[PDB]
Paper text:
During the replicative cycle of retroviruses, the retrotranscribed viral DNA is integrated into the host chromosome by the viral integrase protein (IN). Retroviral IN consists of three domains: the zinc-binding N-terminal domain (NTD), the catalytic core domain (CCD) and the C-terminal domain (CTD). The central CCD contains an invariant D,D(35)E motif, which forms a catalytic triad with two sites that can coordinate various divalent cations (Mg(II), Mn(II), Zn(II), Cd(II), Ca(II)) although Mg(II) is the likely metal cofactor in vivo. Rous-associated virus type 1 (RAV-1) is a replication-competent alpharetrovirus, member of ASLV subgroup A; the INs of this retrovirus genus are a good model for HIV IN.
Residue numbers in the entry:
A (entry chain A): 59 to 144, 153 to 199
B (entry chain B): 58 to 144, 150 to 199
The structure:
């Protein structure tokens, strides 16, 4: 598999409002996780989630953000045997995810921040809606 | 399918991220370890996603009653993954891995000249090398 990964902000999911999103380019499958800060660790724990869900890819493509080009991330991706190169599919995935998140939250009456106790199920439901799990 | 045991243990050499979450597969004795700054429900869930990535999905996970294992957020996560969960005794195999791992961490750090805290930029490769050495004796 060849994946594309990027981070995007979703303030309805605050305080853990940074979403890491990966898309598999051949299948269009999408995995998202939420994070309180954009760090190398956050990217690594997101990829371990995506691997657990979809299988281990041959290569991941990203932009040049510092979470993705750090010595830490470069070391992790070599340890896992995944090649790394430094858009349209991930951007499409972001918009579809944000839309689902907005309509589900506003439907439950949450017009601003979603309470932390409701976030885990609401993000899973948004993700499952865009997939064939 | 697989049955795991998981627990957290503190390792001050790996500070500030000195919380180690450890999972042992009961059939194969394989260990997966990740390190975390705080012991929270999310740290356990990201540890387990890592262990699924390395080992494959288990049928069941056994833990103690620490609050990050029995929280609503952890109960919901385990249910979404379809993993059964069983819970003040402890479990032998994970306590033994905790001991092996701390000994191993000490030996490796000390060979590289780190006598007390390991510099944060060294800790990822060293923890991975310790986990690999125990699995590949
Ligand atoms: Zn970006
Ligand atoms: Zn994490
Ligand atoms: Zn414990």
């Amino acid at each position: 598999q060849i994946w594309q990964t990027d981070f995007t902000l979703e303030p309805r999911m605050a305080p853990r409002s940074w979403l890491a999103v990966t898309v598999d380019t051949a299948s269009s499958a999408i995995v998202v996780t939420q994070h309180g800060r954009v760090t190398s660790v956050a990217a690594q724990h997101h990829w371990a989630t995506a691997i657990a869900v979809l299988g281990r890819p041959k290569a991941i493509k990203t932009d040049n953000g510092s979470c993705f080009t750090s010595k830490s991330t470069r070391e992790w991706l070599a340890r896992w045997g995944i090649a790394h190169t430094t858009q349209a599919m991930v951007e499409r995935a972001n918009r579809l995810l944000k839309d689902k998140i907005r309509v589900l939250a506003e439907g439950d009456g949450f017009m601003k921040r979603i309470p932390a106790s409701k976030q885990g199920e609401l993000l899973a439901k948004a993700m499952y809606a865009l997939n064939h799990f």
